């Protein structure tokens, strides 16, 4: 299915290595890596012209690519510096349209005792709300994570909901002054006032949290944070 | 060697028609527009060296005697929100190189304001709190305090009863948080509701 780059998040102590993968079935020559800092545009790593043929880019100190077949245009990190965090695109051309992947989330950090999963929260649709506009709003609230690698999203009755859901655009930092602040992020679910007055109806909000692996060695006294969910429930209330 | 865009960003309601400028400089040809979602998928628009196209709602023309390009969106809908990129092939290079985008924030028409603050108990002592049903013409202030938060406004659409409404969230710690002085911190309309 197009262009597919793996792993879609990771996180990197400083001095790894690791390859972010993209592949491409559509036999097109032209192959670009991006990378694009949070509110920034694209700026080319490396790019390649068909099978075996490799240009640096605008960006390509610290990275390294190789080409040795169409499908695959690798691109390889030897030593993670913090400045490598980012969100890396690959993307192919034909024909002069742009083809892209769905992007790689890369967070490189000095010690690893700065990640931390969210903790989860839900809060029930108020009262006066209900009686005011028959509507009843949930909120969810996942604080306190590190990286902002997270996937939020309601379940209700034990399927996943996208109507009548909206999840805040970018989350907010903790402490707005610190590079790798801990991250607050809500989203709501608006349902009918009959729906959540009914208490056979069942609500959980989820985060999907992108942690440490068994790469990584831990030290502290906490769980190791990795990758994990995180959820929180609610039954719809009658009273 | 660049690809400048411009407006840096760009807010508009429900029906309105967007453009969205592309200069470049004489060492690129060959541009091309692309949306990023709020998920960050890139999705090409128009290969679009010279001329003009059309795609639905939305439409491109390359001036390349006059080195720019235009994108318009017709009947801006809410789904049309994201950022706008140009990008080109500098000449020679098959290198394909981005502008900085154009933030596009498409806002509903909020057919009947309500707005209201609302306080919203957790599920299992802790409480948030709502602002909701205000027009789009609100804007929803930060925080001027460490310690409070307030995230920014965002749209939820409830699909099946053709409903959209604006909403922030506001919460704290401290011992004399008031859901009646988290969005006072700020201004609300005329005629916010404030039960109990």
């Known amino acids: 299915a197009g262009v597919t780059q793996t792993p879609k998040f990771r996180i990197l102590k400083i001095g790894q290595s690791m390859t972010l993968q993209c592949t491409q079935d559509?036999?097109?020559?032209?192959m670009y890596w991006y990378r694009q800092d949070p509110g920034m545009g694209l700026k080319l790593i490396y790019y390649?012209?068909?099978?075996?043929?490799?240009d640096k880019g605008e960006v390509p100190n610290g990275y390294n690519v190789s080409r040795s077949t169409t499908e695959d245009f690798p691109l390889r990190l030897e030593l993670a510096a913090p400045s490598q965090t980012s969100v890396y695109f690959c993307?192919?051309?034909?024909?002069?349209?742009?083809?892209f992947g769905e992007g790689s989330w890369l967070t490189v950090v000095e010690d690893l005792n700065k990640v931390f999963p969210p903790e989860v929260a839900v809060f029930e649709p108020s009262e006066a709300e209900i009686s005011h506009t028959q509507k009843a709003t949930l909120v969810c609230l996942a604080t306190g994570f590190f990286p902002d690698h997270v996937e939020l999203s309601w379940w209700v009755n034990g399927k996943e909901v996208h109507s009548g859901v909206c999840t805040d655009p970018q989350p907010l930092k903790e402490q707005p002054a610190l590079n790798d602040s801990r991250y607050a992020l809500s989203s709501r679910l608006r349902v009918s006032a009959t729906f959540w007055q009914n208490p056979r109806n069942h609500f959980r909000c989820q985060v999907q949290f992108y942690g440490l692996s068994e790469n990584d060695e831990w030290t502290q006294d906490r769980a190791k944070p990795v990758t994990q969910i995180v959820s929180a429930e609610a039954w719809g209330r009658a009273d | 060697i660049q690809v400048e865009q411009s407006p840096p960003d760009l807010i508009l309601q429900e029906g309105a028609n967007s453009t969205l400028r592309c200069n470049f400089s004489?060492?690129?040809?060959?541009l091309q527009w692309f949306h990023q979602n709020p998920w960050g998928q890139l999705i090409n628009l128009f290969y679009?060296?010279?001329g003009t196209k059309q795609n639905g709602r939305l439409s491109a023309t390359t001036v390349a005697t006059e080195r720019y390009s235009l994108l318009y969106i017709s009947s801006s809908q809410t789904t049309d929100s994201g950022v706008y990129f140009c990008?080109?092939?500098?000449?020679?290079?098959?290198?394909?190189?981005f502008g900085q985008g154009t933030r596009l924030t498409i806002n509903p028409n909020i057919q009947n304001p309500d707005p209201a603050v609302y306080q919203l108990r957790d599920s299992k002592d802790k409480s948030v709190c709502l602002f909701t049903d205000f027009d789009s013409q609100t804007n929803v202030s930060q925080s001027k305090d460490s310690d409070v938060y307030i995230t920014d406004k965002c749209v939820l659409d409830m699909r099946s009863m053709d409903f959209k409404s604006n909403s922030a969230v506001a919460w704290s710690n401290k011992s004399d948080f008031a859901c009646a002085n988290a969005f006072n911190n700020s201004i609300i309309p005329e005629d916010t509701f404030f039960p109990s």
């Open positions: 993307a192919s051309t034909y024909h002069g349209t742009g083809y």
């Open positions: 559509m036999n097109h020559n032209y």
């Open positions: 390649s012209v068909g099978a075996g043929i490799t």
């Open positions: 004489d060492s690129v040809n060959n």
């Open positions: 679009i060296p010279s």
């Open positions: 990008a080109a092939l500098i000449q020679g290079a098959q290198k394909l190189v």
